[PDB]
Amino acid sequence: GELSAYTIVVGTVLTGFGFTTPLGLALIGFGTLIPVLFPAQDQSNTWSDFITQTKNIIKKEIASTYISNANKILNRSFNVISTYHNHLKTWENNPNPQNTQDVRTQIQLVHYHFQNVIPELVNSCPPNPSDCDYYNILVLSSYAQAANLHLTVLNQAVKFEAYLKNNTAIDYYPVLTKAIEDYTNYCVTTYKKGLNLIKTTPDSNLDGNINWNTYNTYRTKMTTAVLDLVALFPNYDVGKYPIGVQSELTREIYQVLNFEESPYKYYDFQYQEDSLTRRPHLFTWLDSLNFYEKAQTTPNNFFTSHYNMFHYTLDNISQKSSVFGNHNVTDKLKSLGLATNIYIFLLNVISLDNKYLNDYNNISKMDFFITNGTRLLEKELTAGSGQITYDVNKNIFGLPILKRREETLFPTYDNYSHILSFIKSLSIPATYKTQVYTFAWTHSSVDPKNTIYTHLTTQIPAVKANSLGTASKVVQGPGHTGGDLIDFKDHFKITCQHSNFQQSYFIRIRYASNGSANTRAVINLSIPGVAELGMALNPTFSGTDYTNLKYKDFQYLEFSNEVKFAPNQNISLVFNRSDVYTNTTVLIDKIEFLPITR
Length: 598
Hints:
Promotes colloidosmotic lysis by binding to the midgut epithelial cells of insects. Belongs to the delta endotoxin family. There is one protein chain. 28% of the residues lie in helices and 26% in strands. With 598 residues, it is of the alpha+beta class. It has 3 domains: 1-239, Delta-Endotoxin, domain 1 (Up-down Bundle); 240-250 and 446-598, Galactose-binding domain-like (Jelly Rolls, Sandwich), CATH 2.60.120.260; 251-445, Aligned Prism (Vitelline Membrane Outer Layer Protein I, subunit A), CATH 2.100.10. The strands form 5 sheets. Strands 1, 14, 16, 17, 19, 22, 23 and 25 form an 8-stranded mixed beta sheet that branches. Strands 3, 4, 5, 6 and 7 form a 5-stranded antiparallel beta sheet that branches.
């Protein structure tokens, strides 16, 4: 949508987990968060915008007094964060005595401000039960920013104190943890209450049908606002990540074209979902876009059909997608290729405007805004000759900037949060001339080289693999892992490229698993030319509903033997399951590398 804080706040946190210091992600991360979340101090309209925008997509109503109240309440954090931020800044470069060193008192206030303002926020809802559920999902995005700030000072407090044990001393680690757990589970819960609200509310405009586009919009906006932020919360666990962490978000989000002027909005919800989005898969990179045009030469040509060319991370085989659309046999192929480190971060599309009639509303022209890392490259893809008579529609797709601006909408080659990853299409030629498209977008924090760093913990999602056994499958993530997970049944291999240095590590796994102590799954890791690790996994949850696994359901296990990689060494990570307990489900989330030698 139109609101860059979502993508910027998320961008700062990813960048923030880069190191590990006595002032944590506060002194610096705050230098960005405060200005982004409070541009007009304690009298901003950030929360209103967040709430109004959410309410504009769900299109349900409540007295605006609830919105301004929420905005009035969360705008208190400004002063409580500003003072804390100063004493901290006042604690570093400024002398290091013991008075301005008494930051421990300031931390106490920020922790007190958040124990009260968040429950206040949630409990200041309309009387009516369900009307209260709607108010809280409508405030969820603001809730998130609050909880994150909260988690940041606690993560900082923990670091701050552990630093003072070297050459009231409160211990916030048990609390930091519970906060990571509660906030995660609440956001996800609330996020689904909204998803279920939409999927449950007939749309008068659609004559009663559930509105899929509304469902999809809410998902795209909330993923970039809440889920993306919630997926990084585990990094705040100073226990788990002592020296810093490099993580990424692998989930896809979609923007759609021709929804309103096409009939498909009257079909079943799940039907549209099935044909407009992609089933859980291993992360893919877009090699090229292939659109067929009509053989004609006369004006008003358009793209008849299309297909995508893509590949798994570090895989030298380029897979091809289905040919969406109505591919004639005498049409011309207009292709747009893409090399490694060359992405589409913004595009312009010109499609035919059927005027709500059973007439073609296809894409006839596209302007891609590509990035190669050093400059902006504009490429074009046109059906026949740009010449167009019929009325046309002009739409822009892509996501907001990833960093605070500096030097057609927002993204630049050196400042973009998402890259194009796929283009699906729903069309039944045998009956209609209309076609609805969706543009898939993945987070630009994902690495094409699966690099393993040496100066901090590297987090490599299991879906960044390029080989998946037949017994295994990729299942939908629960909502807080930042993406999907692998249902490890047999084997799967992820390929990594080491940094230009030498290092020893311990590879650690973040997984989920039911089963019992007598039916533990066993995992063997074969790193050709390097090591042979193996270990038994423990039960972590019970039941078979993996879709709604809780935060506590995922745990961490580490292999005993260590590995050493040479500079720029290409690594093969072959995972095998040898146990017989076929009924013991194991969900692989993240593969972690812990540097041993500083």
